[PDB]
Amino acid sequence: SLLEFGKMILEETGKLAIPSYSSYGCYCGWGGKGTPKDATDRCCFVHDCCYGNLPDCNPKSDRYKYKRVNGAIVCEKGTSCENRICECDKAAAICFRQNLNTYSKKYMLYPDFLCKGELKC
């Protein structure tokens, strides 16, 4: 659920999910059209493709449990869903960190309008 995801993001990046990621570029915060603006934006994209491959699950709402082992995110075992969701979230979060040095305020609150067309995931 967004609760775990949003928390994941602050642990990895140091930024609050809200302002910093709720409306970044074309895919951050949700949306789904356009050509990803940058690296951070490419991760929201990939994260969206990840959620899209869990038809049997409720990604944005099911609570899953995860722990940090020696500074690394580890998805605890739960249902098939809670596990796959958690991995999607971990991948996005970690990515976010990896590209912090390219994070551009220039893309926060980006006009969803400017994004046109649907990329084949």
Next chain:
Amino acid sequence: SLLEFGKMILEETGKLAIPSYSSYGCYCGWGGKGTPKDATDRCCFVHDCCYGNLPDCNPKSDRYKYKRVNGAIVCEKGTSCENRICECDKAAAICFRQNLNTYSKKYMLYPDFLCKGELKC
């Protein structure tokens, strides 16, 4: 406070907070349930998620000051609360303007039974 938030809304969109954004979709208003129905509805969803990260404050009434600098909304300095509350509002109003394009009357006075999922933040 809502008096400042309503001012930004009228400035950025030209519409009055009450009709235009008080009974729109599943989140612009007070009910708050289901899955956002469109761009404008999500701005509202993100906004009260933003008010959620401010437990130690009270957004409805503490008044803050803001001004424009080269036409942009800037939150004047003050107490941590006043500043964070304003950032939530600032973003929301800008979000309503960037989406004036898809704002449709079909979502006004939207029925409760049409607000679906379980969503938390």
